[PDB]
């Protein structure tokens, strides 16, 4: 009865880790998408 | 026996997310530095 509440409580503690990871991974797909626009804005600027 | 086998499995699953957060928390800055430097260097390049 007490060991399950360790397991019930830790699955709450797994959540905010996974909660923060999607908030992390949403940013790294966001900034990189702009970052490859900085590359596409440079490949023409180099040719100029 | 099995519920304690369920605990250390998902506690080991907690170690990946705690690592990957600490992986992501370093990466979100170290792209942003090479983002915000690029956002400054490009305006310098426009005069070039």
How is this structure best described in words?
This is part of a larger assembly, with two copies of chain A (about 50 residues). Chain A is built from two helices and no strands. Chain A has helices at about 1-15, 15-45. Chain A is an all-alpha fold and about 50 residues long. The termini of chain A are far apart. Chains A and B meet through helix 1 and helix 2 of A and helix 1 of B.
Shape of chain A: rod-shaped
The Rg value of chain A, from CA coordinates, equals 21 Å
Query: In sequence order, what are the helices and strands of chain A, one letter per element?
Result: HH
Largest sheet of chain A: none
- Helix and strand content put the structural class of chain A at mainly alpha
Work out the number of β strands of chain A.
Answer: 0
Oligomer: part of a larger assembly
What is the CA–CA distance across the termini of chain A?
A: 72 Å
Strand content of chain A: under 5%
Identify the biggest protein-protein contact and residues per side.
A-B, 24 and 23 residues
The number of helical segments of chain A is 2
The helix fraction of chain A, in percent, is over 70%
């Amino acid at each position: 009865r007490e060991l399950e509440n360790e397991l019930d409580g830790e699955q709450r503690r797994h959540a905010d880790a996974q909660k923060n990871l999607r908030k992390s991974e949403r940013r790294i797909k966001e900034l990189s998408f702009q970052a490859d626009e900085d590359r596409k804005n440079h490949e023409r600027m180099q040719d100029l």
